């Protein structure tokens, strides 16, 4: 009847895709930023980033050479596949930090005073 007095300055904390899970692993950080996601990324993620970049460079060099434009095509294709891999790796690291994936390696490295 009488509505609630609106709070104009407070926006709801909501991401448009909702995970509908509770985490099944210990929670190190419920909300990591990009620095937190990169600084706790595993070596296999960097390996697949470098593999995607190398495959992109080689394939872009092959396809860009038919129109005599091989070097910029190789550089662009390398960056394109590499950023795809980097987004994948950062998401994987953030999910391990939030507790939705296994983080036994991450719990023994991200809590220097809460090690044991």
């Amino acid at each position: 009847t009488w509505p609630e007095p609106p709070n104009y300055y407070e926006a709801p904390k909501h991401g448009f895709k909702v995970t509908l899970e509770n985490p099944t692993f210990p929670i190190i950080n419920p909300d990591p930023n990009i620095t937190d996601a990169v600084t706790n990324m595993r070596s296999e993620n960097w390996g697949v980033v470098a593999g995607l970049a190398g495959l992109g460079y080689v394939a872009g060099y092959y396809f860009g050479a038919k129109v005599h434009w091989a070097k910029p095509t190789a550089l662009f294709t390398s960056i394109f596949l590499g950023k795809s891999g980097l987004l994948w790796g950062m998401s994987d690291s953030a999910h391990r930090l939030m507790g939705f994936k296994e983080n036994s390696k991450e719990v023994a490295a991200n809590l220097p005073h809460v090690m044991q």
Partner: protein, 157 residues
């Protein structure tokens, strides 16, 4: 509430009038009247911003494109069998059955509803558009991109 109900009922008259006339110019004039009147009808429901969007997009932008296309492409052929051929009685029967008698209405079994004015909040709309329906917002952007690229590719050279 005579004038408000009359303004509501005028929209159906203008909807029939768009197709009834033989002049394409007069059809567009009827459509412009209909969209202005509907923008005033939407503001009976409490919507201030969305009625202005209706006006600004449909009358301000799209009807200008309609009038340019009509004025560039229509040499007068209203005598040239637009009057001499008439209309379709089967289509008029379908319109009467479905829109006057309304044998399949949208309310279904219900026949009476209480109209209720709202109170539009643009803070709620901004929160919804940019937090809760953000994927739909981006896909609307992609549709507009399709429109821009596709028009510029289909422009007659």
């Amino acid at each position: 509430m005579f004038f408000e109900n009359s303004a509501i009922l005028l929209c159906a008259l203008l909807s029939i009038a768009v197709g009834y006339t033989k002049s394409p110019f007069m059809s567009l004039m009827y459509s412009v009247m209909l969209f202005i009147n509907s923008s005033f009808v939407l503001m009976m429901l409490g919507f201030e911003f969305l009625a202005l969007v209706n006006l600004l997009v449909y009358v301000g932008a799209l009807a200008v494109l309609f009038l340019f296309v009509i004025m560039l492409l229509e040499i007068p052929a209203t005598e040239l069998r637009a009057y001499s051929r008439g209309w379709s009685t089967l289509g008029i029967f379908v319109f009467i059955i479905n829109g006057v008698f309304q044998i399949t209405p949208s309310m279904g079994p219900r026949g009476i509803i209480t109209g209720l004015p709202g109170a539009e909040s643009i803070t709620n709309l901004g929160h919804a558009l940019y937090l809760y329906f953000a994927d739909l917002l981006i896909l609307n952007s992609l549709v507009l991109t399709v429109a821009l690229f596709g028009r510029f590719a289909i422009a007659p050279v």
